[PDB]
Amino acid sequence: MLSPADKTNVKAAWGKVGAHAGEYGAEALERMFLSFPTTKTYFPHFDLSHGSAQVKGHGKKVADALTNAVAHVDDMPNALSALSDLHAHKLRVGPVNFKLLSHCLLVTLAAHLPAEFTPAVHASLDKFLASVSTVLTSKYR
Amino acid sequence: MLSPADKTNVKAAWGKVGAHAGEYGAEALERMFLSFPTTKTYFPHFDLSHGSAQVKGHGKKVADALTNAVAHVDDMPNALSALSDLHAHKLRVGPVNFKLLSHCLLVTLAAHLPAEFTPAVHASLDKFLASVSTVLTSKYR
Amino acid sequence: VHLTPEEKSAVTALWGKVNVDEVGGEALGRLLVVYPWTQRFFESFGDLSTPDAVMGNPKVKAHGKKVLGAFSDGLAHLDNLKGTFATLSELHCDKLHVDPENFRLLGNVLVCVLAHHFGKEFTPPVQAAYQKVVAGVANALAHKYH
Amino acid sequence: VHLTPEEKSAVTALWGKVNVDEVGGEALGRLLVVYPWTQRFFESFGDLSTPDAVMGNPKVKAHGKKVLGAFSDGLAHLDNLKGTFATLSELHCDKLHVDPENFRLLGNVLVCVLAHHFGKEFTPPVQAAYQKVVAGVANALAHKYH
Ligand code: HEM
Ligand code: HEM
Ligand code: HEM
Ligand code: HEM
């Protein structure tokens, strides 16, 4: 459950991401593929090579949805219903993977927002990605 | 979330547990200690010997709490608030351990309820235990 | 795996009593039913719409017997699982693209199934030996992923 | 662990740039902040009521450097983290009652801190190699639990 500080923290942090969210999306994916090679099992149809247009493109998509969730930090369940749908009934990504992308997203933010990645912001972002994770895997069964 | 189907399954199977809940709780703890030894770090103060009265006593407590969740299947978050508070603030059990207990609780029931432990009841019991776990871990941060 | 001799004997005694045909079908069906997401890999198997549809699907039963067949083989080479499972590991990764976490879920389902089948015979300590074993196999099956 | 000479070099060289004092105090405090239940082992440290209070607690800071210290000494034995951490593993089990899962959390926290610190330098390929080491260390530390 995101506290008022958390939502603030999250909103602040993502605010700085700005025009780079897409790039950060892409980079996180890249870090996940490299660090947790099992995650690649879900993208057999992509070119996973460095700077592949497929990864870039996809990075954008992930970034944009994250953005959308920060904006509806208050109504996540509702803001991401379609996405919860897609993942649960179409994609069928196993739940463990959500923790892997989440972690890689922290790492990426850490690496690019030195000043804003304080211990309190770190905790908030973590809880946020966890919340996003829960929403996205809530219609699994 | 638990469907009406799930609720019927759980009340039915737990119904059968009846007066053995105590012994089954103790048993689930023993299996957990033997298979996932890392869980013992939380019970340094216990005689974990075979047939420890401590374990027996502890098993009833757990079973009693599960019985209480079944009794309030439509208000678990409130029926369990106290225990959520306890596990989050005093015991501070790391999340992953909950899934270890759930799994051994599942093993015990299977071993004792051959007739009721159908694929459908198994799925329902799994979702139930996952929800209980979610509640007990809700106040962690 | 870290199997004491007495764990190894207990694994083997019990396994002697198992009907791989049936246990196999039961474990695989139960997996598709308890963790519906694992159905992604068997869209060509047909109707998996309800529990009766999965448990009784001749394709699920057949596959399950295949999987458990490969598993029993593993049980005879408990000394060299990585070895035993190498080609299968490569297949699951490279051709099938099966997320290796699926192998641990199957492990757990199987332990419930053995509990289901042997009742009291599946003692606390017999389960601890099987836990080691299914963990070993899942590791072996994931060893070749890249 | 199962590091490629190339991956061995990247770990080795980034590390050489690490101020153990700072990174250690920060890895440990971020842990207590992000995963509040880890505080159950540091009751005696004092006020951990706030990010500010953990980050500031010198007991925390000094524990952090003692932790990174041993971690540091372990990168010198990447071929045998098991024998390197055996006594520390027994200690953590038998005396401290620390759940090995915490080893993994720390590891991840550690990787976040290095990224935090090295920005650009901490590339996907460099993170990949560190992920294998933190896993490796966590595994060696949990190795003697019974
Ligand atoms: C941080 C949580 C996640 C978010 C917000 C997210 C978001 C998205 C979005 C926005 C799309 C595109 C939907 C469309 O095309 O309209 C997508 C598709 C997809 N996602 Fe997720 N995702 C998340 C986690 C994951 C994880 C952990 C995996 C696998 C390890 C995954 C696997 C996939 C796949 C395979 C696709 C389709 C790829 C394609 O064929 O283009 N997602 N996701
Ligand atoms: C669904 C799972 C769980 C349920 C229903 C449950 C329930 C309970 C209950 C009813 C108590 C007794 C509190 C009192 O004195 O009134 C308790 C205590 C305790 N639980 Fe849990 N718990 C669960 C999971 C866990 C797990 C997974 C662990 C660790 C592996 C754990 C560790 C403890 C400890 C250490 C105590 C205190 C023991 C003592 O000193 O008497 N619990 N739990
Ligand atoms: C104990 C773990 C497992 C073992 C020993 C095992 C063994 C096998 C064997 C022997 C085959 C046939 C190989 C061939 O076609 O050349 C196979 C195929 C397959 N396995 Fe696995 N398997 C295991 C777990 C799983 C799990 C958990 C999944 C998915 C959740 C899975 C998915 C598949 C699929 C999709 C196929 C091919 C089916 C087809 O013919 O279309 N396996 N497995
Ligand atoms: C990379 C992983 C870790 C390493 C290398 C490590 C290493 C050490 C070392 C070298 C000591 C010195 C104590 C002595 O020699 O008596 C120590 C103590 C201790 N560690 Fe760990 N540790 C690790 C992770 C953890 C984690 C994650 C926790 C808890 C979240 C933890 C809890 C403790 C505690 C409570 C002590 C005792 C401190 C005291 O006496 O006040 N350790 N550890």
UniProtKB/Swiss-Prot annotation, chains A, B:
The record lists its disulfide bonds as none
Maturation and modification: The initiator Met is not cleaved in variant Thionville and is acetylated.
Which residues in this protein are found as N6-acetyllysine? K16
Note one Pfam family from the annotation: Globin
UniProt-reported outcome of changing H20Q: In Le Lamentin
For the keyword Iron, the answer is yes
Q: What else is known?
A: Gives blood its red color.
Q: What is this protein called?
A: Hemoglobin subunit alpha
Curated annotation (Swiss-Prot), chains C, D:
Q: What is the effect of changing H116L?
A: In Vexin; increased oxygen affinity
What changing L32R does, per the record, is: In Castilla; unstable
The listed outcome for P36S is: In North Chicago; O(2) affinity up
Q: What is the effect of changing C93R?
A: In Okazaki; O(2) affinity up; unstable
Name the UniProt record assigns to this protein: Hemoglobin subunit beta
Explain what the record says happens when changing K132N: In Yamagata; O(2) affinity down
Documented effect of changing E121G? In St Francis
| Outcome when changing P58R | In Dhofar/Yukuhashi
Mutation effect (P36T): In Linkoping/Finlandia; O(2) affinity up
What would changing H77R do, according to UniProt? Answer: In Costa Rica
Effect on the protein of changing G69S: In City of Hope
Q: What is the effect of changing Q127K?
A: In Brest; unstable
Q: Which residues carry this modification: Phosphoserine?
A: S9, S44
> Consequence of mutating Q39E?
In Vaasa; unstable
Give the gene that encodes this protein: HBB
Annotated phenotype, changing A129V: In La Desirade; O(2) affinity down; unstable
Q: Where is this site: Not glycated?
A: K59, K82, K95
Mutating Q131E: what's the consequence? In Camden/Tokuchi/Motown
According to the record, mutating V133L results in: In Extredemura
Give the note.
Answer: One molecule of 2,3-bisphosphoglycerate can bind to two beta chains per hemoglobin tetramer.
Q: What is the effect of changing S44C?
A: In Mississippi
Report the outcome of Y145H. Answer: In Bethesda; O(2) affinity up
Q: What is the effect of changing E121V?
A: In D-Camperdown/Beograd
Q: What result is annotated for mutating L14R? A: In Soegn; unstable
